[PDB]
Every structure is written in C-alpha cells, then in structure tokens.
Ligand SMILES: O=P(O)(O)O[C@@H]1O[C@H](CO)[C@@H](O)[C@H](O)[C@H]1O
C-alpha cells in the first residue's frame with residue numbers, strides 16, 4: 001500500500017486564496033502596479049511569497065532594492081495574516097479531517113507539501129497540527145511549484161519514497177510537481193483544468209481512505 005500522503009494546503013485542506021488575492025492586489029495598487037487580477041492570482045497557486053512578489057513587479061518592469069523587496073513582501077504578509085485570524089476548525093474542507101484520522105489509524109504518514117510559509121499557523125488554527133508527521137519548510141525548500149522539490153522534501157520528511165506516496169492537489173502546477181516527484185497525484189477540481197490523464201475528484205468529500213486505496217490499486 002502507499003505509505004504516505006503529501007497534502008497541498010490551499011484548495012485541499014481549506015482555501016485562503018481569496019485573502020492572498022486581496023492582499024497582493026492591495027499591495028500592487030499601493031505601489032502603482034496594474035494587472036493583479038483574479039486571472040493573475042490563479043497563476044500564483046503553489047508559488048512562493050518571493051516568486052509571487054517578483055511576478056507582480058514584472059507587470060510594470062519595476063526594479064526595487066533587496067531591502068525594498070523584503071519590506072513589500074512583509075507588508076503583504078502582515079496584511080494576509082490579519083485576514084486569516086478568524087480561521088478555525090470550521091474552515092476545514094469536507095472529508096479532510098476524517099481522511100487524516102483514517103490515515104493515522106492505518107499508520108500511513110501525513111506530510112504538508114505547501115509553498116506557503118503560513119502552513120504551520122493555519123494547521124494550528126484548524127486544530128490539525130497533531131495529524132501531521134511533518135511539514136516541508138518552504139524557507140528551506142523554496143522552489144515554487146511546478147518544481148517537485150516541495151513534494152520530494154515532504155516525502156523525505158516522513159521517511160517514505162515519493163514513489164510510495166500519494167499527493168493531493170487542486171492546481172495544474174501542483175499536479176505537475178507531484179508527477180515530477182514520482183508520487184501519485186489525485187486532483188480536486190475539474191478534468192478540463194487539471195487533466196483527463198489522472199484521477200480527479202469534484203470536491204474533497206471524495207478524498208476517503210477507501211478511494212485513495214482504490215486509486216493506488218489501479
Ligand atoms: O506568503 P506565503 O503564505 O508564505 O506564500 C504564499 O503561498 C501561496 C500558495 O499557498 C501563494 O499563492 C501566495 O502568493 C504566497 O504569498
């Protein structure tokens with residue numbers, strides 16, 4: 001059987017993308033940059049804070065000092081952290097808590113493979129920390145999806161080969177990252193968006209231990 005499940009955060013466990021959009025758009029507008037729209041933000045799925053900011057600067061060919069860059073990223077992050085202060089166990093997506101319980105009871109390792117450095121805070125707010133055997137640290141493993149690095153790191157963090165792992169993802173870049181790690185992807189979303197070549201479920205209530213085992217056996 002598969003020996004680990006490697007979880008993306010946003011769009012899988014819960015979704016805080018709206019708050020990232022609001023905060024990046026506010027930052028861009030404060031510094032006179034146009035183009036941070038919903039289409040642009042959908043392209044930031046699985047993308048590090050620093051790569052995200054650079055994409056925004058690139059809209060206007062804006063050059064900033066390293067210190068200015070750090071301050072811009074901090075300003076946006078502070079705003080986003082204020083926006084997520086009310087996240088609680090209520091925000092957990094359907095099926096996810098039961099899946100975590102079932103994986104743990106079956107002695108299957110659980111790791112977070114998110115690009116967001118806010119992962120630990122979010123898991124704590126949602127009362128999920130105790131289910132996670134490890135959290136891959138994007139400050140140590142900074143490559144944005146679709147690079148496989150974060151998933152490889154998550155598997156190493158629980159002592160399981162990626163080839164013996166399942167990855168759960170809601171984004172194109174994240175699915176590719178899982179593929180290139182060697183793990184088996186199961187997407188959540190639409191096949192039009194995420195592919196007709198892998199198993200996709202329409203929402204997270206379909207992520208059950210039984211379903212993961214069915215997919216693994218096929
Ligand atoms: O600022 P962190 O929370 O570290 O990173 C975030 O990660 C998000 C992906 O989960 C991405 O969409 C954001 O643009 C990025 O700021």
Ligand code: ALF
Nearest residue numbers: 009010046114115
């Ligand atoms: F939390 Al993600 F790709 F949605 F790392």
Ligand SMILES: [Mg+2]
Nearest residue numbers: 008010011170
């Ligand atoms: Mg995601």
Ligand SMILES: [Mg+2]
Nearest residue numbers: 011170188189
């Ligand atoms: Mg989706």
